[PDB]
Design a protein around this ligand. Sequence first.
Ligand SMILES: *OP(=O)(O)OC[C@H]1O[C@@H](n2cnc3c(N)ncnc32)[C@H](O)[C@@H]1O
Ligand code: NA
Length: 634
Amino acid sequence: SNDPSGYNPAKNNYHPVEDACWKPGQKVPYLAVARTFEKIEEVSARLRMVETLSNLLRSVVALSPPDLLPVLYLSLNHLGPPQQGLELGVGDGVLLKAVAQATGRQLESVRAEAAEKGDVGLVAENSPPPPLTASGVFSKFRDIARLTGSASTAKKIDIIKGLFVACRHSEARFIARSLSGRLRLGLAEQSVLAALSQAVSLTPPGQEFPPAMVDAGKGKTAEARKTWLEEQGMILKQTFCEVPDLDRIIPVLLEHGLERLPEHCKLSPGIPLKPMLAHPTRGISEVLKRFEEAAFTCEYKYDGQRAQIHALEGGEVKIFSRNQEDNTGKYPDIISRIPKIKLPSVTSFILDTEAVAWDREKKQIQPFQVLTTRKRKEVDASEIQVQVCLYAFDLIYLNGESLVREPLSRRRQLLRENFVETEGEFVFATSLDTKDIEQIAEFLEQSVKDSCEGLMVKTLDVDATYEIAKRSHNWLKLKKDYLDGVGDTLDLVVIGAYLGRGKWAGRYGGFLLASYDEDSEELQAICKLGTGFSDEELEEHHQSLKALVLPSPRPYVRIDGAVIPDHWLDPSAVWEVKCADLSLSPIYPAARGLVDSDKGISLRFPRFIRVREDKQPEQATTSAQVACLYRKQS
DNA sequence: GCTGATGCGTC
DNA sequence: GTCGGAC
DNA sequence: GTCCGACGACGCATCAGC
Ligand SMILES: *OP(=O)(O)OC[C@H]1O[C@@H](n2cnc3c(N)ncnc32)[C@H](O)[C@@H]1O
Ligand code: NA
């Protein structure tokens, strides 16, 4: 209706027609989306965020149904279905250059302000064409992603500058955040799905305008309304988990409604699905708690990458990553061995496996780092140098039957009976069915001796299905580095700090750490650190370290190719840091030359544990000790 | 034709 | 990937 | 328990600059 500047989607008793800031048939203004984002970031209760987004979506459904799909993508900061692999090719680098040119400022002034403010959007905002539309912005995002080849970056920057030129009010803030891949509203995929099912439930699509039914919940008690919306939410959520593709779902949702959705969109080979995830567990006793009276199995947790393998009726094979990226082209070796792993009675399947690097000469697992050296796309079978062994642990679909609602006890049995193991090519995950604490503890220890991270734990019959909408983190993961007093901890020196973002703007969000090389009496950067501290600890760090800020680095500190810290720090603080493994680093100088001529050592999954108030830098972990820790990984 | 910086996926 | 915090 | 924002190392693929 009126100026989108005053649009209030957090309004109590929000009316999808009377409270919209645009007219029926009008394109949804982008400022309407931005104002919704603003009202979402103002609150901390997710349910209030969902309500606010639901209000916007109800207006879109009632007034401008063609804009529902772009509005949803803008709210997710997605470009399209993940298996299509669309990429902006735009990060803070390209974006800050576009802002500098748009605002006519020096790139270094923009870069410094962005770091101080903790957000690129704030610089673009505080620094004539028609108003932007939601579908117009989304299409320009897609134009950026389709630009390739030489001189393509300059063309991307041209589009970004044109967007910023047309921005009003808060629009530039959220364009910049979206382009940088850091929307971070506090509302993401789960809340967007909750808002969508609520929106189409309360304001059914496909009504003749003006819609006779703008609030289908008004005739229900609060109790009945909540039960109804929860059921509708599960329909949408479970369908999406099986078909996480809005290009497919939304046209069906608009035409046939949410109740008929499962009839049109069903799990099928060749369409990636969401994978089942795992919740961390701190000890074997904790496991026995959450699985008190439910039989469960323990499996080795292999150190590779997830490979969801689809065999379609007719013989076509597709492979997808855990985030639904198409990996078919990177695994020609897997595609060729499918006839060898499945019995001839199998006509279609979806397998859940871990692809692990495998040394055929030595017949043993290789580290994850080796696996990542494989090529990623347009790979021909003859050129493969790092061989892969598949460790299969689940079966989601078989001979036309979805197993999503079947217990693991049955899925595992169909897996074990219809597929064939070959050493070093296709194996079932090593497993143990027991409830004895002593056998589990020995099994955990043996998993690490056999080159694995620890154990996966899964119920066999109680809440043991593959229904992600019911619970996405339905499995438990028990890694040895979760256990207190177990795993590698290091005492490292804080040599630099990185300015924080969003909530921590003006404070520190990360730090640069170093080990002490006795042979050269130098502090060598080993890794950055940005997790493990409580909010109180991170605030105290910002306080205690202010007295250490240096204008210039000490001459005995070496960081080589590490990211230069925003603030150098006088080497003094020593922190205890835990990691899962030590890796061979091309960038960090710590211990460079002690295990490899050109590469130093860094930490895998580093996290802060506590301050070592009783240690000075000269008693910190030495580069020689780092090298020793790396070697003992064998 | 090559190198290094950047982007974005893996874990 | 790990972690902490609001709900 | 759920969800989400904070942050980590690392590789290939790509393209700007040379
Ligand atoms: O730490 P995390 O949540 O990413 O762990 C889950 C991942 O672990 C991998 N994995 C390895 N071995 C298994 C088994 N046996 N079962 C399930 N997952 C397993 C997967 O890649 C998973 O995403
Ligand atoms: Na990243």
